[PDB]
């Protein structure tokens, strides 16, 4: 009942990157897209890969996840219009590659 080994306990060490950190780990955690890619690819991807990939999946979240050759939100800066973003895992390392807008496909 008395843990004698709490686990409890905070490193000294934290910054305000800690800070970054944890908002990001958590803001990765909340986009719904990445939960579909995450139980999409979860028998390979691994929760570290997560931490690893971290920049990547936030900043995926971060950009524009649609396009404007769908979208008339011409005030998303887009420099690889025409195609939106999505996950992929490369061995050890998630990616983030483009697809062609189905728009295009009528
Ligand atoms: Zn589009």
Redesign the pocket.
Known sequence: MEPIGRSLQGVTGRPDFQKRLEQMKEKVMKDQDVQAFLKENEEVIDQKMIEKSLNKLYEYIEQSK??????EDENCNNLLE???PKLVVNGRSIDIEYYE???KRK
């Open positions: 649609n396009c404007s050759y769908c979208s025409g195609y939106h807008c189905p728009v």
